Amino acid sequence: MIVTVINQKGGVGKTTTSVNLSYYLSKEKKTGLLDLDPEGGATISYGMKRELKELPLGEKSVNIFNVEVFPAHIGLLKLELNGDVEEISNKIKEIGKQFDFLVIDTPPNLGTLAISAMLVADRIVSPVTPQPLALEAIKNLDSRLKSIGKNAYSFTNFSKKVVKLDNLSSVKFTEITIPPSRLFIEASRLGVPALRYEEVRIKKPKLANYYQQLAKVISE
Amino acid sequence: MIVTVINQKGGVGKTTTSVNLSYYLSKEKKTGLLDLDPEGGATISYGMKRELKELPLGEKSVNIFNVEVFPAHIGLLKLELNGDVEEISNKIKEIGKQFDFLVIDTPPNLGTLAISAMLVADRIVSPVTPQPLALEAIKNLDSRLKSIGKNAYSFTNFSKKVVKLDNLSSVKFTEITIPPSRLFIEASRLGVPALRYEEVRIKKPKLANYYQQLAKVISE
Ligand SMILES: Nc1ncnc2c1ncn2[C@@H]1O[C@H](COP(=O)(O)OP(=O)(O)O)[C@@H](O)[C@H]1O
Ligand SMILES: Nc1ncnc2c1ncn2[C@@H]1O[C@H](COP(=O)(O)OP(=O)(O)O)[C@@H](O)[C@H]1O
Ligand SMILES: [Mg+2]
Ligand SMILES: [Mg+2]
């Protein structure tokens, strides 16, 4: 199944969601994480680096922490300017047909790669935050979803209180809410998924519940 | 420069030394880790798995945590069986040619891959514990070094007291003694080097001093 994480505004926790949700899913099922953002955030969250070579989409992958990560590369940049969304879409589907779950990380916009990842996604997932820029972003994403006729789940990040906006009929706001935590910044200094770092840093993990509920909700 | 970690008995810290020392050398210089153990200890130590493909020696490499790790693969099992020591040696020289430091993990024996990595190693290091069978292994390694005309540096693991033996004119015993540490098991369970774990696990780095010292003892 294809899980695409969408948000036209950066810093909302999109890469964190892709990385940690893919890792949580890897535990019982064969999971891949395809990194479509040229920044390569999700590539960095697995201890790696953006390839400074213009590579074909999906040709290269490395299995880190039992996740098949397709690392980011500068080839995306050209795709992200003059790409053919049908061909990237078919490529994403052809890769996903080898995984129980393919989580896709998208660049901070709604361009060619975001459209490619959205039209073939089985589920679209948007993080949301209380500051007003993410609120304008999610409202515009609802118009995106309608004009393409697609759904998207949403969940609240960087907060203790859950964010809900009820005129958005193509965005279902779940109850899931993730508060700030040392774990994210520490694991990012490490360059590992936050869940995996939690597995050994503390005894009773608290981050696993968020991504567990996210997985259960999208699996419906 | 090529560094080969050698030991006949498993469980002394061979992989742990390879991983941590290579990561330490990556701080300033271009460093590679060649995993020649078919079991893939160092490979696991970087969050990867051994390839179930018969790859050629030193073709797959991933940059994990600033280190060019060459993962273990079943092809090693072929080379360990009937590999020509000379050809394996020349290959290892090719692999290490482009690296300021090439650290090599070896299997728990003195077989084909191990002898091939010693015959070309610029320096050879052999961890020792105060365990009877490890004390025996260092004597056997002194024997094999004499048979092939090479030297090795030893240091103590799993102990606060340094181990030293007499009439082993081929192994220099250094004052470096590494004490037990929870950080080691935790970096194992997480799957990263321990010097990178303690980079965030604490505030005043502790384990890096021993590799700081070991680099100095083996560089002069
Ligand atoms: N719930 C959270 N609590 C604390 N820090 C977070 C949280 N979510 C994300 N971060 C931090 O925000 C930074 C950037 O977030 P990221 O996931 O890259 O967002 P995006 O990819 O959408 O820009 C990361 O360093 C991450 O550690
Ligand atoms: N100083 C230490 N204190 C505690 N545990 C250690 C120490 N050094 C290594 N270990 C643990 O011992 C286990 C085996 O060590 P390893 O280096 O793989 O042995 P080998 O030399 O057989 O490869 C690893 O799980 C590692 O975490
Ligand atoms: Mg990002
Ligand atoms: Mg081992």
Q: What is the SS3 assignment for chain B?
A: CEEEECCCCCCCCHHHHHHHHHHHHCCCCCEEEEECCCCCHHHHHCCCCCECCCCCCCCCCEEECCEEEECCECHHHHHHHHCCHHHHHHHHHHHHHCCCEEEEECCCCCCHHHHHHHHHCCEEEEEECCCHHHHHHHHHHHHHHHHHCCCEEEEECCCCCCCCCCCCCCEEEEEEECCCCHHHHHHHHHCCCHHHHHHHHCCCCCCHHHHHHHHHHHHC
> In this structure, how many other beta carbons lie within 10 angstroms of the beta carbon of residue B205?
12
Half-sphere exposure of B83 (CA within 13 A, CB side): 25
Type of residue found at A158: F
- Nearest CB to B190: which of A49, A62, A199? A199
Residues whose CB falls within 8 Å of the CB of residue A28, separated by 6 or more in sequence, listed in order = none
| Gap between the Cα atoms of A56 and A36, Å rounded | 12
Compute the radius of gyration of chain A from its Cα atoms.
16
| Gap between the Cα atoms of B48 and B45, Å rounded | 7
Q: Are strands B31-35 and A2-5 parallel, antiparallel or unpaired?
A: unpaired
Type of residue found at B119: L
- In the PDB record, what is the listed experimental method? X-ray
DSSP 8-state symbol, A23: H
Please list all protein residues whose beta carbon sits less than 5 angstroms from ligand 3, which is an ion.
Answer: A 15, 41
- H/E stretch holding A82 reads helix A75-82
Contact A152, A126 (CB under 8 A): yes
Q: Which of A30, A46, A200 to mutate against chain B (most B CBs within 10 Å)? A: A200
Q: Taking the alpha carbons of A50, A56, A57, A60 in that order, is the dihedral positive or negative?
A: negative
DSSP 8-state symbol, A130: S
Q: What is the number of the ligand 2 atom nearest to the C-alpha of B9? A: 22
| Gap between the Cα atoms of B104 and B124, Å rounded | 10
**Displacement of CA A73 from its chain's centroid (Å):** 17
**Closest residue by CA, ligand 2 atom 18:** B15
| Gap between the Cα atoms of A137 and A160, Å rounded | 20
Note the resolution in Å, 1 decimal. 2.8
- Ligand 1-lining residues (CB < 6 angstroms): A 7, 10-16, 41, 157-158, 178, 180-181, 184-185, 188
> In this structure, how many other beta carbons lie within 10 angstroms of the beta carbon of residue A118?
23
Token digits of residue A98: 């080898």
| Gap between the Cα atoms of A83 and A89, Å rounded | 11
Taking contacts as CB-CB distances below 8 angstroms, the residues of chain B near A49 are 63
Contact A130, A189 (CB under 8 A): no
Q: What interhelical angle do B112-120 and B85-97 show, nearest 10?
A: 50
**How far is ligand 3, taken at its centre, from the CA of residue A16, in Å?**
8
Can you name the residues that pair with A129 across neighbouring β-strands? none
CA distance A131 to chain B (A): 30
| Gap between the Cα atoms of B140 and B147, Å rounded | 11
